[PDB]
Design a protein around this ligand. Structure first.
Ligand SMILES: O=C[C@H](Cc1cnc[nH]1)NC[C@@H]1C[C@H]2CCCC[C@@H]2CN1C(=O)c1ccc(Br)cc1
Ligand SMILES: O=C[C@H](Cc1cnc[nH]1)NC[C@@H]1C[C@H]2CCCC[C@@H]2CN1C(=O)c1ccc(Br)cc1
Lengths: 306, 306
């Protein structure tokens, strides 16, 4: 019992973290097999990053330019290409740690685990969600670039994020491990803003189900809604419309509580229109959206305590 | 920027996690050197556990009774003994992933990372606090026994907790790695309650400092307080007495933000009295007491925004 945002255990990813230096700039890299990936902006000076031409800047650098450290040990760089925003550095040694893995591009509303690093040295692990505006509300300082986000299924790590930058709001942006940004964001030090964000409805519902399972039933009503009419309402309040797939993903929490998905939708519609005063849910005034249907199912499982 | 619950990288601990079976019971063990530690209650049948004498239960058993596995591999047990709550099973192999480690008894108010496992397999890591009433608000399911709690400094893992049971209220109880329970609990399947909990005042103040460091200030005021008039308010809201030793500890954060400890108490005293007016601090609507000063310093920048 008990509800906690959890991170996947970070050990398999820790064995791939390395340090990468080009000039006076150091940041982290991900060493899989005989390749190290890092953000390409590592090759930029303060003047370059304003308006960089990365093919131009890359053609200047040589394998030497890059110092790659795995602990104390030095790693000869024997090659360099560039994929989108990322550098692919071939190195003289193949990482004996490297885990069964894959690169997956995460979807808005999904969660993952971030291993915050500094100077190739892991500092901590935290939970996260990809926002619908394609940023994350992470925790990162200068030096964090190249830190990665991931999920583990079985023994296989699905890498989904590499950190590149902080926006002026104080949120974070980066890429998938094929270097293609989440969002409109570019790797240039220039005013860029987070777009208007949306609440993740799927996760708010899962939370309402957690709340019911977690000893609470005050929000619930007998009012009837269609998916359509719920969705019109969700949007005027900046909630994600609920898709058909979302209805399905909530199926198990519906069976467990016997509150039909649409009825929980009618619950949430009442909360958006009327507010929730002076009432709390799971001890929170506001609605939580970064806890997933999956998280709620796992933690509750498996008996009906009642 | 940002602020998050944030656990230590779990890798060093993941390489010590094993499975211990006695009869039809499976739980987790901690493998250091030649030694595996798990909860002693692994011996117990259903009848035994209501009113169990553990010295007798153990005297009947042999090294053969206990199956320990590390991954696929079997580890032969060649010794066994009871230290307090936990068994020490000696095995014919020395864990080559053994990290520099030590064993510490954690003090109410401090935090640690929990590496939740099932069948010797790590599934999640999250941060917890030892509550003043000596019970942790964790997230554990059946099978999670033997999962441990820990902090890391440099190389060294300080293990502070091993999980034994969930109380009726849904909170969790366990021991240290000497096997002495935290709190008044015993290892028998009977309902046990904890004492009345208290909010950790030192931690709330560190968390308020964290908010300010991240640029959030609405709750500050020009007021100040005496320490004593502040403590007079703590007691009303069931917060813990603040002491001068506790005040000293906030000295670094006070300097960084330029907000005197006694002024932050005024801020808090106002919050407790007037509430929040549907506002949030670091995205929470409730005053957060499971971040230590150390937790704040480690994760926040050493310079303030503005
Ligand atoms: O790890 C790097 C950080 C990550 C971070 C910091 N806080 C949260 N996350 N990001 C580096 C930033 C942004 C990046 C944007 C694209 C072009 C290159 C810049 C480069 N950065 C520097 O601040 C920057 C780098 C070098 C000089 Br000399 C002057 C300025
Ligand atoms: O992993 C173990 C769990 C941990 C947990 C479960 N939910 C959250 N955390 N705790 C084991 C419990 C409590 C323990 C108390 C001391 C004596 C032995 C019991 C044994 N347990 C069983 O429920 C129990 C086990 C076997 C039989 Br057959 C009947 C009852």
């Amino acid at each position: 019992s008990g509800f906690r945002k959890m991170a996947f255990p970070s050990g398999k990813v820790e064995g791939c973290m390395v340090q990468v230096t080009c000039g006076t700039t150091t940041l982290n890299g991900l060493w899989l097999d005989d390749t190290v990936y890092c953000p390409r902006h590592v090759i930029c000076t303060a003047e370059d990053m304003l308006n960089p031409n990365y093919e131009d800047l890359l053609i200047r650098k040589s394998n030497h330019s890059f110092l790659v450290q795995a602990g104390n040990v030095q790693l000869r760089v024997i090659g360099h290409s560039m994929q989108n925003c990322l550098l692919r550095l071939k190195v003289d040694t193949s990482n004996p740690k490297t885990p069964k893995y894959k690169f997956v591009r995460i979807q808005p509303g999904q969660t993952f685990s971030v291993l915050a690093c500094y100077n190739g040295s892991p500092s901590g692990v935290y939970q996260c969600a990809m926002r619908p505006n394609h940023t994350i509300k992470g925790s990162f300082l200068n030096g964090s670039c190249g830190s990665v986000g991931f999920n583990i299924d079985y023994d296989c790590v699905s890498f989904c994020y590499m950190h590149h930058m902080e926006l002026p709001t104080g949120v974070h942006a980066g890429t998938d491990l094929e270097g293609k940004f989440y969002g409109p964001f570019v790797d240039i030090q220039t005013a860029q803003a987070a777009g208007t964000d949306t609440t993740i409805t799927l996760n708010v519902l899962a939370w309402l189900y957690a709340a019911v399972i977690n000893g609470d039933r005050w929000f619930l009503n007998r009012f009837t809604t269609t998916l359509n009419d719920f969705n019109l309402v969700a949007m005027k309040y900046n909630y994600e419309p609920l898709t058909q797939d979302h209805v399905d993903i909530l199926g198990p929490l519906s069976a467990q509580t016997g509150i039909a998905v649409l009825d929980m939708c009618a619950a949430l519609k009442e909360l958006l229109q009327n507010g929730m005063n002076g009432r709390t849910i799971l001890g929170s005034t506001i609605l939580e959206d970064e806890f997933t249907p999956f998280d709620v199912v796992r933690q509750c499982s498996g008996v009906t305590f009642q």
